[PDB]
Amino acid sequence: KMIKVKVIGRNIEKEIEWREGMKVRDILRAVGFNTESAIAKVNGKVVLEDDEVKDGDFVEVIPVVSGG
């Protein structure tokens, strides 16, 4: 299983395989960041740190906040 990490609006594309049993959180905690500085979201959809991930979700880590 592989994951791609990118910063909010950083432009980091990296196809990723997959395994079975993992979960968005795990993948996130795999980068020393369980999605604390940003709202983890995949396929344009948002999820929680415990929201399992699939389709090879990426890894967002960094102040993804914004006030519009």
Indicate the domain borders of the chain.
1-68
**Identity of the residue numbered 65:** V
Identify how the structure was determined: NMR
Residue 20: count of CB within 10 angstroms of its CB: 6
CATH architecture of the region 1-68:
Roll (3.10)
Q: What beta strand segments (E) does the chain contain?
A: 4-6, 41-42, 45-46, 58-60
In this structure, which long-range contacts are made by residues 1-6, counting pairs with CB atoms below 8 Å and at least 24 apart in sequence? 1/56, 2/56, 3/27, 3/30, 3/53, 3/56, 3/57, 3/58, 3/59, 4/56, 4/58, 4/59, 5/31, 5/58, 5/59, 5/60, 5/61, 6/58, 6/59, 6/60
Residues followed by a gap in the chain, C→N > 2.5 Å:
none
Closest among 56, 65, 67 to 7, alpha carbons compared: 65
